[PDB]
Every structure is written in structure tokens, then in C-alpha cells.
Design a protein around this ligand. Structure first.
Ligand SMILES: [Mg+2]
Length: 226
């Protein structure tokens, strides 16, 4: 069922409402995904003015159904299996020596469009720290995203470490703890342990005067033998 919804290019919409240390903001995104190649292309806009956190800190929060699952691993693709009814994705993101984000999102189809709707809450940030102080470089590293079943919840548990480059040459670690649960009562695929290999490139639209981020991302499932 879910797999067939992703054989072509699918339009994507992302909507996020955020509150980080009382700095409220909203972000809207649009683009398309082609899961055949693990490929996402999106443009995000801060619709409330200036984004009060660095764009890179939002990349993980702002559609893992667009991951390329090798044919020999297709039975481990929870994300697509939950579609079109979708899944709830929840995270805590711990910024080392700083505050944390807590996010709740719903990812599902609305007609032919894959939609990610997100509420984000950030607390305990340092006004002078790398996040609220805007000390992070506008770029993004390549990661491994670790996935396990959570049979208790008929869902998955996910963990990984994001490394954000700091302007002084150091790293800002962002420890990610995640769980997904299906929205239907329909069946889903519960996976064996595996991981997703990610890479992302951030850019700017030279004509865009609003605070924004252009994102090109490729993700491939791995760690099972071929
Ligand atoms: Mg097995």
C-alpha cells in the first residue's frame, strides 16, 4: 500500500509553529520528494519575520518516508507503510551545554501532497549561546540515523547525533531521541535494526528577501545485507 504512493515525485508541504524561550515563530515550506532516489528539494520561509534560531537547527524537524529503502530492505520501511493515514513523529533534541527542543509532528497525505505539520517548543536556551546567539555556520553535515522497532507502540524508536559547525571552528552537538507511531490502526512494517545515511546541502535563493533556507537532501537506508 504505502510504497506505491512514493514511486514518483510527490509534492511536499511543511508547516511549523515554534516557541523557543518565548520567541514565537512560524515556518512554511514547499518542495518535492522522489523516494526512488532518496531525494528531497525544499524551500522554507520564516513567515513571522526573522527566524530567532539558526536554520540548521530546524533541518531535522522540518519526512523520512522520502528515504531510499533498497529493494532488499523494503520490508523495513515503517515510514511509507504508515501512509497515507500517516504517523506521529516526536523528538527531544538536546543541544549540548544549552537548551532543548521538543517537537510533535504529524506526517500524512492530504490528497496527493505529503504534509508535515509540526509544533516545536524550545526551553532552557542560553541567550548568549550558539543557538539564540546565532553562532552556527549555514551548512550541514552527513549523519547516521539509527532505527529500531518499538513493538509496544507498533512504531519505531530512533536516535542519532547531529553535529552543527560553530563559527569559531568548534561543534555544537544536538542529541536526537525520536519515536514514531502510526495514525491509522492499519498495519505497519516493524523494522529490524538499521540506519539511514544522510546528506544535506543548504543554500539561499539570491532573489528571496525573506528569511529562508533552500535544502537539498539525499537519504539511503542501510546496515542490512544485499
Ligand atoms: Mg530479520
Amino acid at each position: 500500500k504505502g510504497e506505491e504512493l512514493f514511486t514518483g515525485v510527490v509534492p511536499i508541504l511543511v508547516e511549523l509553529d515554534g516557541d523557543v524561550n518565548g520567541h514565537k515563530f512560524s515556518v512554511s515550506g514547499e518542495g518535492e520528494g522522489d523516494a526512488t532516489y532518496g531525494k528531497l528539494t525544499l524551500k522554507f520561509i520564516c513567515t513571522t519575520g526573522k527566524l530567532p534560531v539558526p536554520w540548521p537547527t530546524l533541518v531535522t524537524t522540518l519526512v523520512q518516508c522520502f528515504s531510499r529503502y533498497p529493494d532488499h530492505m523494503k520490508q523495513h520501511d515503517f515510514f511509507k507503510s504508515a501512509m497515507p493515514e500517516g504517523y506521529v513523529q516526536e523528538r527531544t533534541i538536546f543541544f549540548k551545554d544549552d537548551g532543548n527542543y521538543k517537537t510533535r509532528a504529524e506526517v500524512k497525505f492530504e490528497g496527493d501532497t505529503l504534509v508535515n505539520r509540526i509544533e516545536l517548543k524550545g526551553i532552557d536556551f542560553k541567550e548568549d549561546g550558539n543557538i539564540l546567539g546565532h553562532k552556527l555556520e549555514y551548512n550541514y553535515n552527513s549523519h547516521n540515523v539509527y532505527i529500531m522497532a518499538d513493538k509496544q507502540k507498533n512504531g519505531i524508536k530512533v536516535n542519532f547525533k547531529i553535529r552543527h559547525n560553530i563559527e569559531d571552528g568548534s561543534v555544537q552537538l544536538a542529541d536526537h531521541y525520536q519515536q514514531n507511531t502510526p495514525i491509522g490502526d492499519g498495519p505497519v512494517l516493524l523494522p529490524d535494526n538499521h540506519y539511514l545515511s544522510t546528506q544535506s546541502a543548504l543554500s539561499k535563493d539570491p532573489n528571496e528577501k525573506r528569511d529562508h533556507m533552500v535544502l537539498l537532501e539525499f537519504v539511503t537506508a542501510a546496515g542490512i545485507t544485499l
